[PDB]
């Protein structure tokens, strides 16, 4: 009714839904693709993909289980999904996979069939998924020589250099209990799981903490992947944003909300009450964009992302947009702010209140790791609404106005201008 949180060594967390047809259990390791290193990159995405190799996934397929997995930057998750009654059928199959079995998934016929498929995997991504590719490199340059930089799915380089002796090197350090959280989502009780958990003995590497690295940092920089053979142009730009559990966590998400997200095709999109939109549409400066305030444990990235078949006029594209961003400091309409608060809520909803347990897991697992607990929607909303204009005019005033940016891109970006232009559009001339 307010989400449960109790620890007997294994911090056991759950979240009940009485109208759910199914449920899900799993673990979340409080160390992700940003706890790795330059040459072991993709180790966390390698771990995910053995966990779903036909072997272990045929086991749980007779049982009636489905497994879910994802790696982030600050965190890393291993979830299993099934019918709510077969709730022990989950917990046991989890127990087998992470304390019982070890080299049953770590075969020299398994691992050389997973790594020979996480290699094709990260060779369609950087090959044909430019919007994320661009998005990923954006981190690489903004957070260069620092934790967040390492692409979550790992470089094809440090991904052909890795054997099983390396899957473990990360496992036995960062796959602990004092870095994990067990989650219960969907259609199960707190007294169903934490019972079935204290039912099982053993302890893996107790007392052990996972290790640390130099805290992340940010620096104004570019990286440009020109490719004049690609029909469009993809660009992503940002400033040093705000972390998870930062005073302006919501203030910053409200700002993103204002300019928001465009799709020049859906007539619905064309009518949004966004000021910037007035400009961009005249000549069709782009095909779409969208904003964001990506928050991570140590640092953040407020900016936006755009694709465009309009090559001669990208220079305006970036211009109109970064000028709008100036208003946030000097001239944002209050009535804009309300449409923000309003729309944030709708978005922040379909995020948190989707009828899909697997999401409510990672969400829970990550948050109850970093701050300890989760924060309720009513808590969030109570904050969103407190937000004045002055909220947004002092946040932009430090974060946005005349601060270093972080551009990245690919496709026909000859037209995308230089760094002393772009960066300079962070401000406006004053008397």
Binding site for another protein (CB under 8 A): 402, 427, 429-431
Q: Compute the distance between CA of residue 370 and CA of residue 373 in angstroms, rounded to an integer.
A: 8
Q: Where are the beta strands (DSSP E) in 50-137?
A: 66-71, 76-82
- Residue 358: phi, psi to the nearest 5? -55, -35
* Cβ burial, residue 215 (10 Å; 0-12/13-18/19+): exposed
Residue 394: CB minimum distance to ligand UMQ, A: 15
Residue 164: CB minimum distance to ligand UMQ, A: 53
216 vs 332 by CB, closer to ligand UMQ: 332
Which of the listed partners (ligand UMQ, another protein, none) does 202 bind, with a CB threshold of 5 to 8 Å by partner kind? none
Residue 25: CB minimum distance to another protein, A: 50
Q: How far is CA 230 from CA 136, 225, 307, 422, in A?
A: 18, 11, 12, 23
Relative orientation angle of helices 314-330 and 389-399, to the nearest 10 degrees: 120
Residue 396: CB minimum distance to another protein, A: 13
Neighbouring-strand partners of residue 185: 15, 24
Residue from 165, 201, 231, 430 touching ligand UMQ (CB under 6 A): that is: 430
Neighbouring-strand partners of residue 25: 80, 184
Site string for ligand UMQ, 179-218 (x = CB under 6 A): ----------------------------------------
Residues 2-61 that bind ligand UMQ (CB under 6 A): none
Q: Compute the distance between CA of residue 272 and CA of residue 126 in angstroms, rounded to an integer.
A: 32
Which of the listed partners (ligand UMQ, another protein, none) does 414 bind, with a CB threshold of 5 to 8 Å by partner kind? none
Q: Compute the distance between CA of residue 307 and CA of residue 131 in angstroms, rounded to an integer.
A: 7
- Judged by DSSP in three states, 185 sits in strand
Q: Is 429 in the site for ligand UMQ (CB under 6 A)?
A: yes
62 vs 430 by CB, closer to ligand UMQ: 430
Q: Compute the distance between CA of residue 19 and CA of residue 352 in angstroms, rounded to an integer.
A: 16
Q: Compute the distance between CA of residue 422 and CA of residue 173 in angstroms, rounded to an integer.
A: 43
Residue 277: CB minimum distance to another protein, A: 29
The interface region with ligand UMQ, picked from 135-143, 307-315, 359-367, 422-430 by CB under 6 A, is 422-430
Relative orientation angle of helices 334-352 and 389-399, to the nearest 10 degrees: 80
Residue 430: CB minimum distance to another protein, A: 6
271 vs 429 by CB, closer to ligand UMQ: 429
274 vs 405 by CB, closer to ligand UMQ: 405
Residue 427: CB minimum distance to another protein, A: 8
Residues 376-415 that bind ligand UMQ (CB under 6 A): 402
Contact set with ligand UMQ (CB under 6 A): 402, 427, 429-430
């Amino acid at each position: 009714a307010e989400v449960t949180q109790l620890s007997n060594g294994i911090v056991v967390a759950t979240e009940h839904n009485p109208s759910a047809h199914t449920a899900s259990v799993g673990v979340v390791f409080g160390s992700g693709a940003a706890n790795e290193n330059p040459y072991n990159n993709g180790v966390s995405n390698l771990w995910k993909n053995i966990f779903l190799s036909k072997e272990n996934s045929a086991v749980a397929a007779k049982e009636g289980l489905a497994l879910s997995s994802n790696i982030s930057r600050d965190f890393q998750s291993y979830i299993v999904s099934s019918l709510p009654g077969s709730t022990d059928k989950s917990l046991d199959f989890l127990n087998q996979s992470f304390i019982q079995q070890k080299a049953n998934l770590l075969s020299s016929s398994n691992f050389e069939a997973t790594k020979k498929s996480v290699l094709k995997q990260v060779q369609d991504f950087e090959d044909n998924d430019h919007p994320n590719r661009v998005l990923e490199h954006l981190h690489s340059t903004a957070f260069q020589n620092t934790p967040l930089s390492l692409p979550t799915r790992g470089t094809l380089e440090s991904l052909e250099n890795l054997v099983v002796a390396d899957l473990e090197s990360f496992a036995n350090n960062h796959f602990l209990n004092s870095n994990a959280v067990v989650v219960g989502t969907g259609n199960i009780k707190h007294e169903d799981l934490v019972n079935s958990i204290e039912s099982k003995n053993l302890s893996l590497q107790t007392g052990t903490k996972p290790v640390l690295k130099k805290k992340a940092a940010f620096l104004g920089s570019e990286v440009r992947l020109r490719d004049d053979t690609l029909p469009k142009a993809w660009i992503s730009l940002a400033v040093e944003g705000e972390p998870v559990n930062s005073p302006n966590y919501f203030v910053a998400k409200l700002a993103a909300q204002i300019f928001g997200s465009y799709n020049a095709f859906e007539p619905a999109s064309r009518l949004q009450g966004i000021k910037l939109l007035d400009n961009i549409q005249e000549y069709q400066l782009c095909d779409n964009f969208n904003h964001f305030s990506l928050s991570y444990k140590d640092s953040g990235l407020w900016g936006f992302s755009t694709a465009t078949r309009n090559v001669t006029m990208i220079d305006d594209l970036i211009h109109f947009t970064l000028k709008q961003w100036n208003r946030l400091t000097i001239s944002v309409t209050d009535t804009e702010v309300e449409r923000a608060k309003s729309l944030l809520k709708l978005q922040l909803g379909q995020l948190y209140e989707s009828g899909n347990p697997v999401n409510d897991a990672n969400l829970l697992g990550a948050e109850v790791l970093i701050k300890g607990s989760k924060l309720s929607l009513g808590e969030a909303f109570k904050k969103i609404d407190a937000i004045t204009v002055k909220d947004v005019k002092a946040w932009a005033g430090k974060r946005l106005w005349d601060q270093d940016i972080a551009i990245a891109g690919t496709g026909q970006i000859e037209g995308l201008l230089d760094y002393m232009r772009i960066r300079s559009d962070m401000s406006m001339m004053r008397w």
